[PDB]
């Protein structure tokens, strides 16, 4: 996350971290339930092998509360496209159930119609992760969050040099140096309504990080709510 701030105690509990064979984070995810993590399909191709670690607030050192979970099954979307990142969504079934506790809790999955009319129509959303603190800097050892305004579709398309499909949406600022970055991908984008946070997107990609005239591209979850429903019944 470029800009924004570190999550405050209990603030970003639905955050998950895909750690590679070296136990280093390379992508994020959203805790959907005790056995399921939501993430980006494209992250599936960025690690030889990985596990999902939850409850982590500082990757620097073990402070207790963290738990690593092995993945039992990977449910990547069939129509995922590596060039446009269309259908950039995947669900992960854990071998062992997460134990909801402090800084470890799921994010609500909203009903599609309501999310569109009442969530996607909010002024902003929230994105978090341990990704790059700068377009070419190091990743954050601390879990960070950033409120990002929702960006109109045409405005998004216009500002994009790459195709913006209906399975995506834009969030972020025009020139303000705040945005998600490499390392946050797969991570959550949630919209708050009356102090209840609903998953609304998946950090997918973006031309650089916090670039002028550039926005953050998120997988539009509302387009995959039924798909996620069926996926969470797998194995």
């Amino acid at each position: 996350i470029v800009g924004g701030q570190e999550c405050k105690d209990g603030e970003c509990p639905w955050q998950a971290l895909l750690i590679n064979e070296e136990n280093e984070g390379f992508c994020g995810g959203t805790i959907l339930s005790e056995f399921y993590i939501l993430t980006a399909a494209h992250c599936l191709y960025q690690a030889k092998r990985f596990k999902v670690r939850v409850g982590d607030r500082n990757t620097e050192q073990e402070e207790g509360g963290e738990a690593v979970h092995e993945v039992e099954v990977v449910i990547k979307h069939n129509r995922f496209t590596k060039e446009t990142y269309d259908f950039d969504i995947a669900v992960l079934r854990l071998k062992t159930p997460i134990t909801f506790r402090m800084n470890v809790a799921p994010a609500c999955l909203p009903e599609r119609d309501w999310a569109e009319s009442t969530l996607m129509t909010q002024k902003t959303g929230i994105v978090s992760g341990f990704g790059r603190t700068h377009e070419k800097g190091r990743q954050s050892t601390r879990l960070k969050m950033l409120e990002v305004p929702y960006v109109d579709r045409n405005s998004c398309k216009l500002s994009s040099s790459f195709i913006i499909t209906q399975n995506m949406f834009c969030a972020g600022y025009d020139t303000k140096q705040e945005d998600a970055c490499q390392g946050d991908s797969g991570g959550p984008h949630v919209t708050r309504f009356k102090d209840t946070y609903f998953v609304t997107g998946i950090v997918s990609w973006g031309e650089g990080c916090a670039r002028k005239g550039k926005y953050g591209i998120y997988t539009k979850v509302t387009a995959f709510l039924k798909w996620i429903d069926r996926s969470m019944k797998t194995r």
């Binding site: 799921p106 609500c108 119609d113 309501w114 009319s117 009442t118 309504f193």
Partner: protein, 91 residues
Amino acid sequence: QCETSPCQNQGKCKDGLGEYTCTCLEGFEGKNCELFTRKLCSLDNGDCDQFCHEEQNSVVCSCARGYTLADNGKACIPTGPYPCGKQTLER
């Protein structure tokens, strides 16, 4: 103070002192029952704590898994210590 008939839409005016009270009938809110009860979700999410949709030109609230719709039919009651979407603000 009920003399002036301050309750609108046939409200139940109950007198007291330098004040009066209106008990609103069906489909009215406000000190004088002058406001229209939740008929759409666009205005205040229909007073719903979470999901809102309209059933028969009327607002109907619902909640996410791990919650139960309260008796008032607006609020959402957690069924557990860790419902989805709630930050774990414990300390």
